[PDB]
């Protein structure tokens, strides 16, 4: 089918990409980076995230595959040494697809931008103190004062979320997870402290208290937003699809990345 | 319908229970503590947990209601002052039921006991060091050395789980959450550290390494188990059902218990 | 003696300052904001920190007093209602001084700036990833990747340090404490995770790995430093002195601010 | 001088001990386990702790040395391969001694026992809930409800203290550190959460609230104490002395044990 290949751009990755293209040339496969059905990322997780965002408008038409040319990336299923095996297996096709959930961020102003995240969306102040009211399904839950907030997808729970003390969640769970960055807690200021895990259809809204300017990151990408009225988080209706050619269970991937390999 | 009422046993609770019985006597309601369809707990969360375990074999036939006579309990929907309003509403019926997930613990020996938990099941050594291999869906994940392990249901995430740094999870999510108690981590001993959240159908098995004796708690109840071969955790097929008479959202209950009220 | 009074600048603080000046006019006391021997701060802890920095070159000649006109500040010993009592007690003098330790930060370039902190000094990247080698007494200790690092004095341990999970340390201990902000830890990246507490004369040096630009905060004040070669932390030889008129033990101040009051 | 050697008791350790004895026989050295001036521990940190307690009444007369026959122990300075070098260096003598601080625990009843700790002293309930009032220098600081409390020496901060989230403290600092084990915190129950670091001469007293029976551990050794009125913690006047033959800085020892080696 139609496929394309992105590369991190070092020599190792570019060469691997050129060799996979040459091998695909031996099959009924057309290189097309406008309407691919398969997107192969050669690099690291950053490369994979960039491929995801390059095709975020055709996620229902695409299956993604990641090859890690450095150490094991979490969105990587293959080592460079398995590239030829991969070419052959994709060629035939008949592979199964697995889907992971995504995070929708909506930023309203004074006038609305939406963003999709594979790992997480975070919010910090644009300089100066960060203070927001946290509203869950229209219920005022807490006033947060501190460094920032991180909202993670399931597959992002092993990324920034983990470093903030979040739980690691199996990606079959349709949820998002909110973690705190250095909140202040004394007899006058109080937050929940604990990570919070939200199901589909729950909406978490951050509402400014004084300053209305925020730095909002989605995956690698950080944008200054001015005059913000609301930042809304919910699990997206959209999912990312992976081509799978063999079992590599999530919990084994976690073991291999954090325990030993 | 058939109902019964348990009491924590102080004067406040016993009297409230006697007055509710008198008020139910004015309706088509039969006091029956063998086959109730409604179980009212008057007390605290400990009282509620005891009521749950008293009827754990008829959970599909029962709706539970908790009245808190001390400060707000998490399984409590009513204050003592609303008891008469409760009697009247239960009387008519037509209320809706909400279900929360439960945790199944299986203990194998050398020969199998099962337990159901509403809050959590924990495991510690029977004295002497605690060392277990943690196996997830038959995949060896880590060797845990430390004080113990806690596996929580969603509604138990605001209990012991919270104190161990676990995420708080909305109870519509069918999951269980594993938290560590003081693990050792150095260049020779390594655990994941992070809480782990498991979906339905995943099985987490603890396998002894040296000592085979363990203290296993389920909710308030701690038992010494000897000659253990395996402790298996999975989300139960069984659910607890609550009678609901008005909206009291989980996240509001969390706010009221931990933020302010 | 010579004294001056700083105000947060709201009406409450300005008026209290004018009234204390009027009361000092009834004693052998000269208002002098060039060479004060007593510096009174009326406001909050931010006001107090600004007073400290306004006189950081004469700390051996000055005793500081803080009045909190909002909720209890940690550098505050007096409520506004005790101002007249304060005027009278300072007037006579004969009070005792208590000293707390301070933190010296040295920033080297390519060419050296020093800074004194009462609460802490933090370092983050100027945008882009933060990576530094952490060198303790010339011994390479770890390579830190994450959001940043915080080095606290003893009296700053109840401030940002606390929110980062640091220990609270009695201020008679001559030490500084280093806490992590969201470090990455996987099989390739490793930090100690735990706060570290250093005695006098130990030197902690941060050395860039790739990017040499950093945002360095000292107390409220954040500066972009370019082309950095080293950031050096050590307990200062200099101390801040407080006028004390009654016992208000540190641990009671901690109880009153975080437990209940 | 007079020396003795303890062994963990496996074949490796016993043989190393027999060979060191044979090598000491070539010098003016008398094996004496009643009044040693040098105590060599061959084993792990548990072996070292047992040697410390075997001679806790003559700590001012003794210098300790640890040889680790497994992986690096924290009280170990030597690998088995350096034993002959050690024999020769001890033989001559002229080595320098370094001192680390210790923890004094006093248990009062209804009638007083004291204990010295090298790593820590912990307290838990004897079964049933653990509730104590925490009193610092006679000031009621908090009521603690949870699993237990850990009070660490500086050199014990890399042991249980670390697993409980405590700071690691250089052992030249004369202090003790109190960490929480799973405290409950909601709108009715509140603790400080943060580790607390106390200087010499501060006294931390735990006072029962209901149950008066506690399990108190000192280093490896756990005792049931009944009818307790008070448990008092303070930094001891007594110190442990090590023979040092070369530089092995604490922070390097920390790096080697937790970062990489
Ligand atoms: C500390 C600065 N950030 C990094 O060094 N990030 C790269 C590392 O993270 C790994 N990674 C990624 C990734 C990625 C690419 N990143 C850009 C790096 C450019 N070279 C962006 C991601 O950074 C994460 N990030 C940001 N700040 C962080 C922090 N303080 N601590 C931990 N992670 C942090 C955040 O989530 C973001 O999306 N997704 C996952 C995942 N799903 N599971 C497990 N691991 C994962 C990746 O293999 C590598 O090991
Ligand atoms: C520290 C010792 N334990 C207690 O003091 N427990 C009672 C307190 O916990 C509240 N609670 C309960 C409950 C309960 C009844 N308990 C028996 C008490 C007898 N009087 C048993 C439960 O104890 C929990 N527990 C045990 N050890 C703990 C610890 N170290 N830290 C925190 N919780 C701990 C554990 O999960 C167990 O099941 N379920 C929930 C829930 N779902 N959500 C939110 N809060 C909840 C209850 O309102 C009260 O405030
Ligand atoms: C979250 C953004 N910062 C604040 O809201 N800070 C003010 C609050 O902190 C209290 N405070 C201060 C102070 C102060 C003044 N601050 C400027 C505020 C301007 N209005 C600067 C200080 O901010 C600290 N800070 C920064 N980021 C933080 C974070 N994420 N979490 C916690 N603290 C944080 C940091 O250490 C800095 O120096 N010194 C101490 C102390 N010694 N003991 C105990 N409490 C203390 C003060 O009473 C008030 O309650
Ligand atoms: C988890 C059960 N305990 C152990 O496995 N302990 C042995 C391990 O700890 C190391 N260790 C020791 C030691 C020791 C000997 N121990 C008996 C073991 C018998 N085989 C007793 C000590 O256990 C500590 N301990 C207890 N419970 C713990 C827990 N949950 N987490 C972490 N440590 C825990 C506690 O402090 C006690 O004194 N002193 C230090 C130190 N100073 N610095 C750094 N490391 C140190 C030792 O090298 C080994 O790696």
Tab-separated table of N, CA, C and O in Angstrom, chain A residues 142-176:
chain	number	residue	atom	x	y	z
A	142	UNK	N	-10.429	22.636	42.929
A	142	UNK	CA	-9.362	23.202	43.745
A	142	UNK	C	-8.829	24.432	43.031
A	142	UNK	O	-9.074	24.617	41.837
A	143	UNK	N	-8.158	25.303	43.782
A	143	UNK	CA	-7.350	26.369	43.194
A	143	UNK	C	-5.897	25.920	43.309
A	143	UNK	O	-5.417	25.655	44.417
A	144	UNK	N	-5.236	25.781	42.161
A	144	UNK	CA	-3.878	25.265	42.071
A	144	UNK	C	-2.886	26.420	41.978
A	144	UNK	O	-3.050	27.298	41.150
A	145	UNK	N	-1.898	26.444	42.875
A	145	UNK	CA	-0.802	27.402	42.853
A	145	UNK	C	0.484	26.603	42.852
A	145	UNK	O	0.658	25.750	43.703
A	146	UNK	N	1.371	26.874	41.906
A	146	UNK	CA	2.583	26.043	41.859
A	146	UNK	C	3.265	26.234	40.520
A	146	UNK	O	3.114	27.273	39.889
A	147	UNK	N	4.006	25.215	40.097
A	147	UNK	CA	4.783	25.409	38.865
A	147	UNK	C	3.970	25.127	37.596
A	147	UNK	O	4.310	25.656	36.517
A	148	UNK	N	3.002	24.245	37.661
A	148	UNK	CA	2.242	23.862	36.485
A	148	UNK	C	1.466	22.579	36.697
A	148	UNK	O	1.439	21.997	37.786
A	149	UNK	N	0.830	22.137	35.614
A	149	UNK	CA	-0.018	20.937	35.594
A	149	UNK	C	0.288	20.129	34.336
A	149	UNK	O	0.609	20.703	33.303
A	150	UNK	N	0.173	18.802	34.425
A	150	UNK	CA	0.455	17.906	33.301
A	150	UNK	C	-0.735	16.985	33.118
A	150	UNK	O	-1.200	16.371	34.098
A	151	UNK	N	-1.293	16.931	31.907
A	151	UNK	CA	-2.369	15.985	31.629
A	151	UNK	C	-1.840	14.963	30.620
A	151	UNK	O	-1.567	15.340	29.488
A	152	UNK	N	-1.862	13.686	31.000
A	152	UNK	CA	-1.227	12.612	30.221
A	152	UNK	C	-2.247	11.655	29.620
A	152	UNK	O	-3.271	11.342	30.228
A	153	UNK	N	-1.949	11.147	28.422
A	153	UNK	CA	-2.636	9.966	27.923
A	153	UNK	C	-2.085	8.707	28.608
A	153	UNK	O	-1.079	8.740	29.338
A	154	UNK	N	-2.731	7.560	28.389
A	154	UNK	CA	-2.204	6.295	28.950
A	154	UNK	C	-0.795	6.007	28.486
A	154	UNK	O	0.092	5.780	29.324
A	155	UNK	N	-0.532	6.082	27.178
A	155	UNK	CA	0.843	5.794	26.737
A	155	UNK	C	1.794	6.906	27.156
A	155	UNK	O	2.987	6.680	27.300
A	156	UNK	N	1.279	8.107	27.415
A	156	UNK	CA	2.190	9.084	28.002
A	156	UNK	C	2.451	8.922	29.484
A	156	UNK	O	3.279	9.675	30.009
A	157	UNK	N	1.831	7.954	30.159
A	157	UNK	CA	2.063	7.872	31.594
A	157	UNK	C	3.468	7.443	31.931
A	157	UNK	O	3.939	7.783	33.017
A	158	UNK	N	4.205	6.840	30.973
A	158	UNK	CA	5.585	6.475	31.216
A	158	UNK	C	6.552	7.601	30.851
A	158	UNK	O	7.767	7.412	30.967
A	159	UNK	N	6.048	8.778	30.479
A	159	UNK	CA	6.874	9.915	30.070
A	159	UNK	C	6.857	10.974	31.178
A	159	UNK	O	7.112	10.629	32.331
A	160	UNK	N	6.623	12.249	30.864
A	160	UNK	CA	6.645	13.290	31.905
A	160	UNK	C	5.798	12.913	33.113
A	160	UNK	O	6.198	13.107	34.255
A	161	UNK	N	4.629	12.346	32.873
A	161	UNK	CA	3.747	11.924	33.967
A	161	UNK	C	4.511	11.106	35.026
A	161	UNK	O	4.355	11.328	36.236
A	162	UNK	N	5.340	10.149	34.574
A	162	UNK	CA	6.068	9.302	35.513
A	162	UNK	C	6.967	10.137	36.408
A	162	UNK	O	7.041	9.920	37.621
A	163	UNK	N	7.691	11.098	35.809
A	163	UNK	CA	8.616	11.936	36.562
A	163	UNK	C	7.914	12.813	37.591
A	163	UNK	O	8.557	13.221	38.545
A	164	UNK	N	6.640	13.069	37.400
A	164	UNK	CA	5.820	13.887	38.311
A	164	UNK	C	5.115	13.039	39.337
A	164	UNK	O	4.310	13.576	40.146
A	165	UNK	N	5.382	11.721	39.339
A	165	UNK	CA	4.839	10.802	40.332
A	165	UNK	C	3.519	10.167	39.947
A	165	UNK	O	2.882	9.555	40.815
A	166	UNK	N	3.120	10.274	38.674
A	166	UNK	CA	1.878	9.714	38.183
A	166	UNK	C	1.933	8.191	38.154
A	166	UNK	O	3.017	7.571	38.176
A	167	UNK	N	0.756	7.584	38.093
A	167	UNK	CA	0.643	6.139	37.913
A	167	UNK	C	0.942	5.786	36.449
A	167	UNK	O	0.668	6.567	35.528
A	168	UNK	N	1.470	4.599	36.238
A	168	UNK	CA	1.581	4.085	34.857
A	168	UNK	C	0.316	3.298	34.545
A	168	UNK	O	-0.053	2.405	35.320
A	169	UNK	N	-0.360	3.614	33.447
A	169	UNK	CA	-1.651	3.015	33.145
A	169	UNK	C	-1.606	2.251	31.828
A	169	UNK	O	-1.135	2.763	30.805
A	170	UNK	N	-2.141	1.058	31.846
A	170	UNK	CA	-2.225	0.288	30.605
A	170	UNK	C	-3.019	1.069	29.562
A	170	UNK	O	-4.112	1.576	29.860
A	171	UNK	N	-2.536	1.114	28.313
A	171	UNK	CA	-3.192	1.930	27.271
A	171	UNK	C	-4.537	1.412	26.779
A	171	UNK	O	-5.245	2.135	26.055
A	172	UNK	N	-4.967	0.211	27.140
A	172	UNK	CA	-6.350	-0.117	26.838
A	172	UNK	C	-7.337	0.688	27.689
A	172	UNK	O	-8.545	0.590	27.464
A	173	UNK	N	-6.881	1.428	28.691
A	173	UNK	CA	-7.812	2.147	29.555
A	173	UNK	C	-8.059	3.507	28.916
A	173	UNK	O	-7.108	4.258	28.703
A	174	UNK	N	-9.329	3.835	28.631
A	174	UNK	CA	-9.612	5.121	27.992
A	174	UNK	C	-9.697	6.203	29.074
A	174	UNK	O	-10.736	6.416	29.694
A	175	UNK	N	-8.578	6.892	29.308
A	175	UNK	CA	-8.505	7.817	30.437
A	175	UNK	C	-7.439	8.861	30.139
A	175	UNK	O	-6.666	8.743	29.177
A	176	UNK	N	-7.417	9.900	30.980
A	176	UNK	CA	-6.334	10.849	31.035
A	176	UNK	C	-5.982	11.053	32.502
A	176	UNK	O	-6.825	10.860	33.394
